[PDB]
Ligand binder design. Structure first.
Ligand SMILES: Cc1nccn1Cc1cccc(C#N)c1
Length: 460
């Protein structure tokens, strides 16, 4: 029975508004309603992995697991295995997989981050799950960020605290936060970004939604505008939104947006908004295609509609050769030529690199580079031809070209990372000097660049 080279992943996000669900929620798992929807001809075909994020979830873990498993069994006739379930307050993530994947899944990690301080600590934050699927790392984050049209800066701060402090994936990757630890990272939830238009435009906004004319609303979506200005979710993707705003509805219909200020809302307006979102970030040149992104029309127990997204995602097998794992394969090498880092830092310490990869027995520390002044005020750290030759565990090009090298640039004085990036080994050629590039980030913010050339030797 062959190992897959592709899987399909369902991502769901639903703020349940502290209400039990209705008896039927199958439309959610089938990607039916508004937006980019799944073809009817696929309805019996199970996804490989279902990841369900809920917010304001009033159910026990047991109660929700029963509803999810029975939902998927009715759809697919498959009894899904529970990979992980993790709850922080009323924020929950559930990972379910086809039984045929049970022995493909390992290294399951769960964590949560509570956001805010005092007043603002007690119900917002994130839960997450990570695991290996054969040779591929997968990470999943469900976050409920700060509410309120006038708190986009707080939401961006929540994002940075979640990606700094959520402890998922391989702890040996110590310089790297979750935005570098996974082949595929899915981040979803009630991100709570609003359509930033005047309160007096509420009925105009409703009109536009009834006409399915979303262009002038999306141009004011705080998540799209904040992402465009590189304030949040740097280097994440999102599919185009072609579904109505998922918030704020009157319960038990989808016919009415309830936007007016009420004591129940702290006298705040809730203009129609795309609160409920799915984004992702995959390593360079790994196959990831969004095949649905939409909202249900028939689940109305909450003031939010459920959102679905599905993805094709490239996966690799757990590779064994006569040599690695357990030794190097002398027929393989990774060389870096003419490499330099450009850092936004004002500091004057020496810097060294760390190369981390599951194609190495352990990470590799370089010698210090040579600092020069850049023409426009920057620090340029030159490595020239000084970088250590990396010794992969397996030389087979069917393995090695699918791998990635994570790069950290660290201060010699403090050993702290100033920047983290990732280089794909999916090169146009082997035994050939080829340009490489990655931006560098720290706490998910741009801190500089790493560029140079690579020369990859495989056994072919
Ligand atoms: C195969 C195995 N033995 C111990 C732990 N695992 C990984 C695991 C745990 C729970 C659910 C799944 C699935 N699906 C996989």
């Amino acid at each position: 029975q062959p190992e897959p080279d592709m899987i399909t992943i369902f991502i769901g996000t639903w703020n349940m508004g502290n209400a039990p669900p209705p008896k039927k929620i199958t439309s959610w798992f089938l990607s039916k309603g508004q937006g980019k929807t799944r073809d009817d001809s696929a309805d019996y075909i199970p996804h490989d992995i279902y990841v369900i994020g809920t917010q304001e979830d009033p159910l026990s873990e047991k109660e929700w697991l029963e509803i999810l498993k029975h939902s998927l069994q009715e759809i697919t006739s498959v009894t899904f295995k529970t990979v992980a379930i993790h709850t922080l307050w009323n924020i929950r993530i559930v990972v379910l997989a086809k039984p045929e994947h049970e022995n493909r899944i390992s290294h399951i990690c769960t964590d949560n981050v509570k956001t805010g301080i005092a007043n603002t600590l007690g119900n917002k934050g994130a839960v997450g799950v990570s695991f290996m699927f054969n040779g591929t790392s997968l990470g999943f984050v469900n976050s409920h960020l700060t509410s309120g049209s006038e708190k986009k800066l707080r939401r961006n701060q929540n994002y940075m605290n979640i990606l700094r402090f959520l402890a998922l994936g391989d702890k040996k990757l110590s310089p790297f936060n979750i935005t570098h630890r996974f082949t595929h990272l899915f981040w979803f939830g009630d991100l709570n970004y609003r359509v930033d238009l005047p309160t007096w435009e509420a009925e105009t906004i409703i009109q536009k939604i009834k006409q399915q004319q979303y262009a002038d609303l999306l141009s004011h979506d705080q998540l799209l505008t904040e992402r465009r200005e590189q304030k949040v979710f740097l280097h994440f993707e999102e599919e185009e939104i072609t579904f109505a705003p998922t918030y704020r509805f009157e319960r038990l219909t989808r016919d009415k947006y309830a936007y007016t200020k009420q004591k129940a809302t702290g006298m705040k307006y809730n203009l129609p908004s795309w609160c409920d979102r799915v984004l992702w970030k995959s390593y360079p040149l790994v196959h990831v295609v969004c095949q649905s992104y939409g909202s249900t029309s028939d689940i109305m127990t909450s003031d939010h509609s459920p959102v679905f997204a599905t993805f094709e995602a490239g996966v690799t097998s757990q590779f064994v050769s006569k040599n690695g794992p357990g030794t190097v394969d002398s027929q393989g090498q990774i060389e870096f030529l003419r490499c330099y880092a450009t850092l936004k830092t004002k500091s004057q310490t020496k810097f060294y690199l760390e190369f981390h990869s599951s194609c190495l027995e352990s990470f590799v520390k370089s010698q210090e580079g040579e600092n020069e002044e850049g023409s426009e005020g920057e620090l340029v750290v030159k490595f020239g031809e000084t970088l250590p030759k990396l010794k992969p565990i397996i030389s087979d090009p069917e393995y090695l070209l699918d791998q990635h090298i994570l790069i950290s640039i660290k201060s010699s004085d403090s050993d702290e990372s100033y920047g983290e990036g990732c280089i794909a080994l999916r090169l146009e050629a082997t035994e050939t000097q080829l340009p490489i590039y990655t931006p560098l980030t720290h706490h998910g913010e741009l801190t500089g660049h790493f560029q140079g050339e690579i020369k990859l030797q495989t056994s072919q």
